[PDB]
Scaffold this active site. Structure first.
Site, mmCIF file in Angstrom:
data_model
loop_
_atom_site.group_PDB
_atom_site.id
_atom_site.type_symbol
_atom_site.label_atom_id
_atom_site.label_comp_id
_atom_site.label_asym_id
_atom_site.label_seq_id
_atom_site.Cartn_x
_atom_site.Cartn_y
_atom_site.Cartn_z
ATOM 1 N N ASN A 26 0.801 -1.216 0.000
ATOM 2 C CA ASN A 26 0.000 0.000 0.000
ATOM 3 C C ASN A 26 0.840 1.274 0.000
ATOM 4 O OD1 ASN A 26 -2.155 -1.852 0.271
ATOM 5 N ND2 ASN A 26 -3.334 -0.318 1.402
ATOM 6 N N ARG A 39 -3.255 -14.954 -0.663
ATOM 7 C CA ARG A 39 -4.420 -15.278 0.146
ATOM 8 C C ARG A 39 -5.180 -16.470 -0.438
ATOM 9 N NH1 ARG A 39 -6.652 -9.187 0.906
ATOM 10 N NH2 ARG A 39 -5.995 -9.255 -1.295
#
Ligand code: CL
Ligand code: HG
Length: 384
Positions: A139, A274
């Site tokens: 991010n 994930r």
């Protein structure tokens, strides 16, 4: 409608490294030893700020961060109280290691003593603290803080900008220490384990790091204050990072292809993230890596092949008519390059409609982003 299943990524542990290819990876051992060392130092340091029995201060601010650290404002703005305060906030939240966490507005309060560096749950009522992303480049973390710090520095008097420079140098030392023996970069460092230990291209993490060190090596964007010894290291680091990008490109037996969000630090092959993110070539992350390589002055043939290859597969795999403008599946099957999707249940599909709407929505499985690397390649092929 159900290709296969998604397996978890593999943490960079001492046993994976104990497989020393003949005193070849005595480097990775040292790497982990430093990671572990720093990690303990991090936790002990925060703990040392609290007094015995002193209640934990509230968790720090969370939310959109990057927008509170604008890097394109006018020069004058960086001499304002508003910019000076963002710098102070930044300096106060840097971890002992020299990094920063993500999703943290830096226009609010300064970190209180004993208050977490990045974030944790409210200690509801009626030293084991949360430790996730406590030093990440996801991010836009860490990289943005160092750039902002440098802008402020460049517009202030040398005698009035020591703290910001010092935090900037710590940040640069942080990025230098976390770099893998083979030039790659983990999403979190000190190592947190899991897919976070993978060479992270995801979200431009590695590209941003390499562009930062590149600029430091050049002494631009306000890094002119950086000691030559350190700028030399940033250069060597940038070269290593470029190499990594090269030695990781997926080669479909003869041909070159995309890259995929993450790669194993040891296997180098695309790995998973994930539950709904299986090991697979990534359109969007490839376009970014390509735009980065095309930026290189006087590319070596090795870099020349990489660019030409990736740009090509980016074209062998497109979309007719989410339609009108060119399209690309976020992920493509390594085997048999075809659109691939997944769900929170480790199942890999070949159709967005074969996924829980929770995942079918929000997360974007298709995109036009890659186009940017095409228009760029055009003008690039020329001078090369
Ligand atoms: Cl130039
Ligand atoms: Hg590498």
């Amino acid at each position: 409608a159900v290709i296969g299943m998604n397996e978890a990524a593999s943490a960079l542990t001492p046993s994976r490294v104990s497989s020393l290819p003949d005193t070849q990876r005595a480097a990775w051992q040292e790497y982990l030893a430093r990671s572990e060392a720093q990690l303990s130092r991090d936790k002990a340091s925060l703990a040392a700020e609290l007094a015995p029995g002193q209640p934990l201060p509230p968790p720090p601010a969370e939310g959109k961060g990057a927008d509170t650290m604008p890097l394109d404002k006018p020069a004058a703005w960086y001499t304002s109280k508003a910019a000076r305060h963002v710098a102070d906030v930044i300096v106060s939240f840097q971890t002992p290691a020299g990094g920063w966490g993500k999703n943290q507005p830096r226009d609010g309060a300064l970190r209180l003593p004993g208050q977490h560096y990045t974030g944790e749950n409210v200690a509801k009522v009626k030293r084991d603290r949360d430790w996730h992303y406590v030093g990440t480049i996801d991010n836009d973390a860490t990289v943005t803080e160092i750039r902002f710090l440098a802008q402020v520095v460049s517009q202030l008097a040398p005698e009035e900008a020591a703290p910001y420079r010092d935090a900037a140098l710590k940040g640069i030392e942080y990025l230098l220490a976390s770099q893998f023996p083979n030039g790659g970069w983990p999403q979190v460092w000190p190592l947190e384990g899991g897919y976070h230990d993978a060479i992270t291209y995801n979200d431009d993490a590695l590209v941003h790091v390499a562009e930062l060190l590149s600029d430091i090596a050049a002494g631009r964007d306000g890094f002119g204050f950086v000691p030559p010894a350190i700028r030399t290291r940033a250069l060597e680091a940038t070269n290593a990072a470029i190499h990594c990008i090269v030695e990781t490109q997926v080669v479909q037996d003869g041909k070159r292809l995309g890259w995929g969000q993450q790669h194993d630090a040891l296997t180098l092959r695309p790995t998973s993230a994930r539950n709904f993110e299986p090991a697979a070539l990534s359109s969007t992350e490839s376009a970014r890596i390509l735009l980065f390589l095309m930026e290189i002055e006087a590319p070596s043939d090795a870099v020349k092949q990489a660019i030409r290859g990736g740009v090509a597969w980016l074209n062998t795999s497109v979309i007719r008519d989410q339609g009108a403008k060119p399209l690309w599946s976020r992920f493509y099957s390594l085997d048999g390059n075809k659109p691939v999707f997944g769900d929170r249940d480790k199942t890999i599909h070949d159709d967005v409609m074969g996924i829980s709407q929770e995942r079918r929505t929000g997360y974007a499985w298709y995109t036009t982003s890659p186009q940017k690397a095409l228009s760029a390649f055009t003008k690039w092929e020329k001078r090369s």
